[PDB]
Design a protein around this ligand. Structure first.
Ligand code: MN
Ligand code: MN
Ligand code: MN
Ligand code: MN
Ligand code: MN
Ligand code: MN
Lengths: 314, 314, 314
């Protein structure tokens, strides 16, 4: 199977500059090489160049709507393209708002996909519920069918077509959630595993349940959108939104390993890696390394070890 | 429901000066305010002024018996008072010896209460078994009915009436126990979950069993006495008696969230926060912050998020 | 029961000087005294003096073969000796290559022993599969019966007799395994619990299974070879080969506590503690302290506490 890396140097989804450097930091760390050592064929499409929309006035509270909307439109085009050729896409972020384009494009080819969202936040805030106009905290709002017309159309997002329903998404690692978002998730009946369910059940059972919930009836391709801040800051400190008490390096890898085993991984997002937020070079290194670690994992690198088939090492 | 904060600036229960500053530190961090944002009605009773007993000669090994016994008599009076008006009491510590008065007062109004003791220590040492005359390591000895008359009456504690039995208490987090204390808990058949049971069962099952054990037959008010050193020093370093290998920030929150869910929380103690033992301002901040986090949790703040009823955020 | 401490100042098993200071650092921390307060009789045999083989040319890739082979022959002699007198041996190391001699000597007296290897690595690499000629990563290759004659005889190891089979060993904590080693363990059907099984099962169930696997049929003496790097670097940073995402301080103690409870502990190795690799004195202290803690644990020190029998503390 085919893997296509696509870099998304975007940061207008939030106030902290730096996430655009994320894809570079990940390649710098040898992401693309390491991936070649796996049983997959890797092709590095490169980084997308996003055209900046001049005079991008805020829509009410929402900041940089047109710039974010346009970059996402371009990214959904690219993703739809590679998905069509039957390759597995891997989007290196930039902030999480780029999940809009990543999942939209993916859905065009695989309309029956399900989403596993690893994050400390829901990021379902609608343009009306945000306390800040930051779009990196609103991705899911634009993607839900049940949230259609529950908010004003925003400049630059008219191309977006609400692709997945509340029954197709599962959250894991939810700790920081706004009142509005919590209202939405309870009202729409969205399945989630906040850190308290992870504590109660154990990562092992959590994955067992998200799979029986999303794949019980029909087996369908999976889109894993991963916000590095879904891990405790002790593992991924270089992110704009650190929340203590998150997933452990082990639980993170555990998930990726289980998802690899389903054989259904179809799309992946490695978001919110911000190199400039590390208080020491080591903090940046720590963050990058585990992100690379989760990616390689999604693809077969097991902690128990790997050996090439047909090779008699004796 | 009513919440009444009562500050207990006491430190004579142990050697290290500093725990008296505990209540101030917690208030500084915005405890009383944040609590106001919850669905509860909050009233801050202020800090109690403890009269120092001059010429407080040690009783054999026990230090400051009269000073400790008196303050505790004063605290029990205040607690019995607020409990009577049907409010939930929250005692901010000083050292853990103040649990004597907190639980005594509480039992006067709710004689059928049960106690969940989160600590790395049992603190059941009797005046005869202590290696140090420190009273912060002897609270439970004065409260157990089964320990009545097994030790000499101590100056200043004649007002205390053994209120709970060995069947009404459950320990969680035990990791540093003295030979004598261990003898006591084994002999009296006190239920406990040391770190090895937590490792074996998982905090989830642990809480399940402490509830079926204490509430299986009769539903009764709960008194949660939390010794901040119950968590690993990595989360609550500013305490006088840190023991490695303790409860994780997540497990602590998990316990409080489950106790909130029972709807039976009646009394709470946030003990042993010593601001002066932090080896960096950050270590003190870390400690205070999680203590506050625990409190807020004991009152409804969920990691999955909280939203106000009847408010349509859309 | 008899305890005999045997120091193994060895470091030629790998490139990083410093592990020879391991036994000194451990005694320095009060290991031998502390172990005295336990219910066991302790005898400190001292540190073995290893004769350095001059003109120790590499055997193909393998470095210091003769020096390592000779030191191990001497250690096996000493261990066979104490085991014979019916005492429990405790080898303080240097590098893990000294497991060859420790287990060989042990097997001479107890041929039906089983081995519980706690390490982040397998260390089964054969002289032909090593990427480096380092022997600390080859111990198990020399001990397996199934690996006999699968590699050239090495200068200095002719005295070694493959004592245990693939059915007699269980790995716990595996996270860093080479392709070759992975091939070997899969091919030979060796039971192991890599970090992912620990994640999935929980340390509690893992121990349950390693015991039903190794002791289900016949109860036999247990040799616990503990590589300190089997725990996460956050607990044992002063080692030559740290791998992130390992066993927690709690899980480590949980293992030793369960092993103590079987009553079958016969041999023990506390390997890879390298004092000179600590980036701060605190890191060295942290490492030593937990190594000491694990040892004391193997011999009865419980987290729930201990009390001497027949002593009425009341
Ligand atoms: Mn986030
Ligand atoms: Mn996100
Ligand atoms: Mn304590
Ligand atoms: Mn206490
Ligand atoms: Mn190792
Ligand atoms: Mn080893």
């Amino acid at each position: 199977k085919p893997i296509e890396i696509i870099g998304a140097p975007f940061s207008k989804g939030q106030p902290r500059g730096g996430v655009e450097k994320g894809p570079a930091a990940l390649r710098k760390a040898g992401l693309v090489e390491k991936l070649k050592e796996t049983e997959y064929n890797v092709r590095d499409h490169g980084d997308l160049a996003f055209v900046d929309v001049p005079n991008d006035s805020p829509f009410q509270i929402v900041k940089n709507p047109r710039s974010v909307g346009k970059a996402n439109e371009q990214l959904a085009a690219v993703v739809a393209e590679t998905q069509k050729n039957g390759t597995i896409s891997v989007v290196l972020g930039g902030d999480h708002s780029m999940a809009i384009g990543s999942i939209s494009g993916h859905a065009r080819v695989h309309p029956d996909l399900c989403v596993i969202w690893v994050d400390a936040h829901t990021e379902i805030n609608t343009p009306l519920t945000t306390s800040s106009g930051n779009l990196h905290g609103q991705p899911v709002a634009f993607l839900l069918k049940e949230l259609k017309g529950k908010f004003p159309d925003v400049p630059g997002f008219s191309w977006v077509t609400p692709c997945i329903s509340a029954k197709d998404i599962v959250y894991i690692g939810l700790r920081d959630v706004d009142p509005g978002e919590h209202y939405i998730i309870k009202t729409l009946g969205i399945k989630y595993f906040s850190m308290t369910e992870v504590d109660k059940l154990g990562i092992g059972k959590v994955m067992e349940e998200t799979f029986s919930y999303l794949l019980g009836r029909k087996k369908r391709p999976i889109h894993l959108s991963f916000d590095v801040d879904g891990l405790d800051p002790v593992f991924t400190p270089a992110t704009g939104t650190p929340v203590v008490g998150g997933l452990s390096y082990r639980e993170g890898l555990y998930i990726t390993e289980e998802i690899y085993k389903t054989g259904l991984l179809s799309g992946l997002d490695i978001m919110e890696v911000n190199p400039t937020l590390g208080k020491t070079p080591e903090e940046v290194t720590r963050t990058v390394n585990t992100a690379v670690a989760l990616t390689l994992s999604c693809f077969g690198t097991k902690r128990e070890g790997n050996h090439k088939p047909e090779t008699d090492y004796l």
